[PDB]
Symmetry: C2
């Protein structure tokens, strides 16, 4: 899996090769590659690792894979996904807000944006 | 170079490799890979091949490489880039609108979005 990390704090985006499976978190891949996604609880509660994920390959409108902890945090910040109908109707490729500590690294390519501030602030 | 093509007309994004040593425009890569970016003039005049490019690796904020023809088309559709300072200051990785027939593929990875309608309508 190829992951491109991007942040206002990084003058260059960082391309990372990540081996799929392993139950590796997206935050774990970032931490292993020195990409400073903010984090605290590492457990889907504090919301620090909020990232904006664009799926580069695979389905244009992917089925939603958020954990229940994600859904509570994302609701609290207004970053819950729109439905597949709304997402399919837009002209721009819809990103998905996720918590990086809750996102499992699979065999797909991602662009992962984060502001560098805790909570995606 | 790896180019992910994405469009509402594409149920999956298409991961394409643009090969080394081949001088190609982005439109040429799309045409060779069956990616249905609209085109007509293939010469930067008609605006048909307007795409929204996200630079996946390399610099976060691009020095603009627009041709004079692109600048005219982009001015006409209101898609000229903002200043680099403005682009650097926003939270979301700014894409660049370009004409695919004017964009020379180099050794960088791109996400290339297009609506499927001429001019990106
Ligand atoms: S670090 Fe608390 S939500 Fe991921
Ligand atoms: S095909 Fe006419 S501007 Fe590119």
């Amino acid at each position: 899996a190829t992951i491109y990390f991007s942040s206002p704090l990084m003058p260059h985006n960082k391309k990372v090769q990540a081996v799929a499976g392993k139950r590796s978190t997206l935050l774990g891949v970032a931490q292993e590659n020195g990409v400073k996604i903010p984090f605290e609880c590492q457990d889907g509660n504090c919301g620090s690792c909020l990232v904006k994920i664009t799926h580069l390959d695979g389905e244009r409108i992917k089925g939603m894979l958020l954990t229940d902890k994600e859904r509570n945090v994302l609701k609290s910040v207004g970053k819950l996904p729109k439905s597949e109908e709304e997402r399919a109707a837009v002209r721009d490729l819809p990103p998905t807000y996720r918590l990086a500590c809750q996102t499992i690294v699979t065999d797909e390519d991602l662009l992962v944006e984060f502001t560098g501030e805790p909570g995606g602030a």
